[PDB]
Scaffold this active site. Structure first.
Site, PDB file in Angstrom:
ATOM      1  N   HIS A 147       0.840  -8.587  -3.257  1.00  0.00           N
ATOM      2  CA  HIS A 147      -0.247  -7.598  -3.124  1.00  0.00           C
ATOM      3  C   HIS A 147      -0.516  -6.549  -4.429  1.00  0.00           C
ATOM      4  CE1 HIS A 147      -0.643  -3.219  -1.704  1.00  0.00           C
ATOM      5  NE2 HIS A 147      -1.669  -3.937  -1.117  1.00  0.00           N
ATOM      6  N   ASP A 168       2.549 -14.092  -0.125  1.00  0.00           N
ATOM      7  CA  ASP A 168       3.227 -12.691  -0.151  1.00  0.00           C
ATOM      8  C   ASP A 168       3.911 -12.557  -1.369  1.00  0.00           C
ATOM      9  OD1 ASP A 168       2.343 -11.914   2.217  1.00  0.00           O
ATOM     10  OD2 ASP A 168       3.879 -13.218   3.434  1.00  0.00           O
ATOM     11  N   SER A 177       6.092  -1.684  -4.464  1.00  0.00           N
ATOM     12  CA  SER A 177       5.641  -2.877  -3.962  1.00  0.00           C
ATOM     13  C   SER A 177       6.039  -3.859  -4.960  1.00  0.00           C
ATOM     14  CB  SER A 177       3.988  -2.631  -3.978  1.00  0.00           C
ATOM     15  OG  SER A 177       3.575  -3.961  -3.424  1.00  0.00           O
ATOM     16  N   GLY A 178       6.724  -5.028  -4.497  1.00  0.00           N
ATOM     17  CA  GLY A 178       6.823  -6.078  -5.600  1.00  0.00           C
ATOM     18  C   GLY A 178       8.441  -5.766  -6.359  1.00  0.00           C
TER      19      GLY A 178
END
Length: 246
Positions: free
Chosen positions: A58, A101, A196-197
């Protein structure tokens, strides 16, 4: 420095703590800050070797250009980086094909491994973190003016085995095996953790192993629902594969 062995003892924020804690500076040396070419922190990542960072796919949505990304290593401050932080450009972006993902970021140049920049270890293929395993999710978070604004934070999360996480009462069967859950089945946070990540590391034996990658899309923890992360152990052959060929 062996992977997963911080040179500064993480404070290991107790689970009960609301909002987690500010990390002891450099106690999570594999913690990367993904940035735009304009100094903007917008994602977390995990240094897995000196030329490779693992992060959520993402994080790469804005741009398909490796050059659009700057990986900053060894930081604690989000904005006012200490003079020792390393800033390295991404030269490659490899998207995990089966789930798409997570993605591997190859760094333009290998990161200098120091006491503040040390990669996280990778689990053995298919390892399944045991239910209740205590892990920490680290990251800067987006919210500002909030506790620890601009400081690397950590939150202790116990892993919730998939069979339990998938009960209709929590994730109602949405989490796959290539995923893992973490966060209290009750009393948990009502917010998306880390970045995120960002990393979901779990101490094991001698060191911290990167067991999950944060991907808020899979699900953030609700008070009565754990968060869902990408189960790194199901992508290790792909990762080590991408790392020995490129």
């Amino acid at each position: 420095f062996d992977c997963g062995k911080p040179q500064v003892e993480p404070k290991k924020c107790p689970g009960r703590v609301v909002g987690g804690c500010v990390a002891h500076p450099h106690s999570w040396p594999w913690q990367v800050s993904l940035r735009t070419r304009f100094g903007q922190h917008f994602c977390g990542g995990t240094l897995i070797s000196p030329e490779w960072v693992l992060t959520a796919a993402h994080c790469l949505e804005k741009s398909p250009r490796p050059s659009s990304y700057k990986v900053i290593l060894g930081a604690h401050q989000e904005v006012n980086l200490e003079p020792h932080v390393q800033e390295i450009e991404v030269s490659r972006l490899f998207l995990e094909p089966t789930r798409k993902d997570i993605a591997l970021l190859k760094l333009s140049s290998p990161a200098v491994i120091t006491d503040k920049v040390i990669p996280a270890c990778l689990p053995s293929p298919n390892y399944m973190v045991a239910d209740r395993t205590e892990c920490f999710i680290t990251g800067w978070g987006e919210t500002q003016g909030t506790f620890g604004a601009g400081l690397l934070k950590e939150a202790q999360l116990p892993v919730i085995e998939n069979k339990v996480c998938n009960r209709y009462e929590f994730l109602n069967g949405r989490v796959q095996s290539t995923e893992l859950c973490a966060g209290h089945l009750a009393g948990g946070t009502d917010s998306c953790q880390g970045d995120s990540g960002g990393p979901l590391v779990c101490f094991e034996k001698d060191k911290y192993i990167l067991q999950g990658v944060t991907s808020w899309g899979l699900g953030c923890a609700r008070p009565n629902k754990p968060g869902v992360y990408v189960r790194v152990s199901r992508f290790v052959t792909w990762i080590e594969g991408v790392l020995r060929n490129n």
